[PDB]
């Protein structure tokens, strides 16, 4: 009602707890499950969606509300990922050679990003503060940078010759680039097949959980080397059969949704802050 303003809220201790609202949210919320193709392959049952829907029905969710979205692999899913359900759960398979790419994907979907358009053919770009990154996604995004000085001359590079530009991304499907702050960088990006955006990490995205399937603690959703936080929405599971993984996800869905929350940036209260 008073949408554009942040009015302080006064709460009283000893105010009685409301009853559990888990049943109501399960009855009014949509749960998108994201899994890789190899999961469906190994399961090898064309009716498994119906079985999972019935199991969720036993666990509370109405049998029209759980969605299953399939992606090929981590690198492909990272291109313009779109998580539209009330609650999104991503079964991300672990690979020892894709640690940075898993970290980038989680950082992109476990946190809320406010992205402004980048025109590297028009402007020199600079990162203001520690929350400001350059997020680029596409079929193949290769990014080279030239850090400039106060006189606009390049440092260790020449603005005219792009071959000297320091290379920070090669043939990436998603890459979050962090450079020194306050220094203007000329950017050479393969814009033809990938978009770069100047983004700010507003805060967590609480309606998205990532379960790392069969790896170790490697995700780094913060560019600061001194911090490697393990939020409640980044789980890890050992596995041999994808059926057991899905069974665990169903059986502990109460716990999973507990670790998440309705997208704060969403819903009517957020109106006139950024979205809805």
């Amino acid at each position: 009602q008073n949408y554009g303003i942040n009015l302080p809220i006064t709460g009283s201790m000893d105010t009685a707890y409301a009853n559990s609202t888990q049943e109501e949210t399960f009855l009014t919320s949509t749960l998108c499950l994201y899994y890789p193709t190899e999961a469906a392959t190994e399961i090898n049952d064309n009716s498994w969606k119906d079985t999972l829907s019935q199991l969720f029905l036993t666990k509370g969710w109405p049998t029209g509300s759980v969605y299953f979205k399939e992606y090929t692999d981590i690198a492909s899913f990272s291109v313009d990922p779109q998580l539209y359900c009330d609650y999104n759960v991503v079964l991300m398979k672990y690979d020892a050679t894709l640690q940075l790419d898993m970290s980038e994907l989680a950082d992109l979907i476990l946190n809320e990003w406010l992205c402004n358009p980048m025109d590297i053919t028009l402007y020199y770009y600079q990162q203001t503060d520690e929350a400001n990154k350059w997020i680029s996604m596409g079929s193949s995004c290769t990014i080279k940078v030239c850090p400039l000085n106060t006189q606009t001359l390049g440092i260790g590079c020449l603005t005219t010759d792009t071959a000297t530009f320091e290379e920070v991304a090669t043939a990436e499907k998603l890459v979050i680039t962090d450079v020194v702050d306050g220094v203007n960088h000329k950017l050479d990006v393969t814009t033809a097949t990938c978009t770069i955006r100047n983004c700010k990490k507003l805060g967590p995205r609480e309606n998205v959980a990532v379960i790392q399937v069969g790896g170790s603690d490697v995700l780094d959703i913060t560019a600061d080397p001194t911090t490697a936080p393990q939020t409640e929405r980044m789980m890890r599971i050992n596995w041999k059969k994808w059926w057991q993984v899905f069974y665990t996800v169903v059986d502990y869905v109460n716990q999973i949704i507990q670790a998440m929350s309705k997208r704060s940036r969403s819903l009517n209260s957020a109106a006139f802050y950024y979205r809805i």
Binding site: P8, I9, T15, S261
Partner: protein
């Protein structure tokens, strides 16, 4: 009230002074006052009321005078005096109980029981003598339109209240900026908590303000100001304002910064204390304003530097607290306190006799509800019953 107090004081003096072996000169004035009381009460019928479970009682006075002609009081004298004293004490206690369980909205300071209204008649004014107790002295001064004050050790001026205000919040309750406070009795514990530790605040300072509006003015108040709030210095799981969910509080205590305690009267600053802790004196105020700041420590050792990251998640929430204890004060009106038994006596008498709820006080004489809505009618009734309770305490 003055007459009831005089009766009680006479009886208390007679109990304390009419003792075997004592010189009559020690008690002569008291014996004159006692005989005056007997003369004034003789021939009068009184009825103490049947309100609640308090029984109807009828009182008759046909007592003889105490002797005056001995050099030293003897055992016979003490026994004769005690017989009359016991009856008078019973009557005064019953009148006090009958007055303590009654209330009026239109005129709550005037007597309510029939016996006390009868005793306010001019025919009983002869009983009146030394009005030396604090409550009766205040009563007389207030009837004279004179400035008088009750002295309270740990006055119960603050209604009980444990609440919080969230100035920055979100549905997940993980980047919260706000205040937690307990106002209880004579004690205030306040604490400003910032989860981001003012990482992204102007000048790296987060300001907290807490205003407590006292329902009555306090004067010559001795107050202890301590720079931390132990009530909000440990991990807590706290309901949300609607109680829909529960959030997590994980304090790490920093020194409060720019601590400014203002004691204000009519919106004007009377006393101001900056970065002062220990004993302070609030001479006259109706409001307490506590300003304090969480200042991000410019330098941090690695153990400290870890606790406060540049961004979320925030696991260690930086809290700065103040504690304000009113040790002693003076009030125009009557109040409960840690030393006096007036409230406890009134409540006990109201409970023992199943006194229904009236149009003045809250049920059970609950002090929080009473002090929250301290209306003039409530004040009048409450001073009346407290004076009567003190008068009863002289004998019971």
């Amino acid at each position: 009230m003055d007459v009831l107090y005089s009766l009680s004081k006479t009886l208390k003096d007679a109990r304390d002074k009419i003792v075997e072996g004592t010189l009559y000169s020690n008690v002569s004035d008291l014996i004159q006052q006692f005989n005056q009381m007997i003369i004034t009460m003789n021939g009068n019928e009184f009825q103490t009321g049947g309100i609640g479970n308090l029984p109807i009682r009828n009182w008759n006075f046909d007592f003889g005078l105490l002797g005056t002609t001995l050099l030293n009081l003897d055992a016979n004298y003490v026994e004769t005096a005690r017989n009359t004293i016991d009856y008078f004490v019973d009557f005064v206690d019953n009148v006090c109980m009958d007055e303590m369980v009654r209330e009026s909205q239109r005129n709550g300071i005037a007597p309510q029981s029939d016996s006390l209204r009868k005793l306010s008649g001019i025919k009983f004014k002869r009983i009146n003598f030394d009005n030396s107790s604090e409550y009766i002295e205040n009563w007389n001064l207030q009837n004279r339109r004179q400035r008088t004050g009750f002295t309270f050790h740990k006055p119960n001026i603050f209604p009980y209240s444990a609440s919080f205000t969230l100035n920055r919040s979100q549905p997940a309750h993980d980047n919260l900026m706000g205040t937690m406070w307990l106002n209880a009795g004579s004690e205030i514990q306040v604490a400003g908590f910032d989860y981001s530790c003012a990482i992204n605040a102007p000048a790296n300072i987060q300001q907290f303000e807490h205003i407590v509006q006292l329902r009555r003015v306090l004067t010559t108040a001795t107050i202890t100001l301590l720079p931390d709030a132990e009530r909000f210095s440990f991990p807590r799981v706290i309901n949300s304002a609607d109680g829909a969910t529960t959030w997590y509080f994980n304090p790490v205590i920093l020194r409060p910064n720019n601590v400014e305690v203002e004691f204000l009267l009519n919106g004007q600053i009377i006393n101001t204390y900056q970065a002062r802790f220990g004993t302070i004196i609030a001479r006259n105020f109706d409001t307490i304003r506590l300003s304090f700041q969480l200042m991000r420590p410019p330098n941090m050792t690695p153990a400290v530097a870890a606790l406060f990251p540049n961004a979320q998640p925030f696991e260690h929430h930086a809290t700065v607290g103040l504690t304000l204890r009113i040790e002693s004060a003076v009030c125009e009106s009557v109040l409960a306190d840690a030393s006096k038994t007036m409230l406890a006596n009134v409540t006990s008498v109201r409970q023992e006799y199943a006194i229904p709820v009236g149009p003045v006080f809250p049920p059970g004489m609950n002090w929080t509800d009473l002090i929250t809505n301290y209306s003039p009618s409530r004040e009048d009734n409450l001073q009346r019953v407290f004076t009567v309770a003190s008068i009863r305490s002289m004998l019971v």
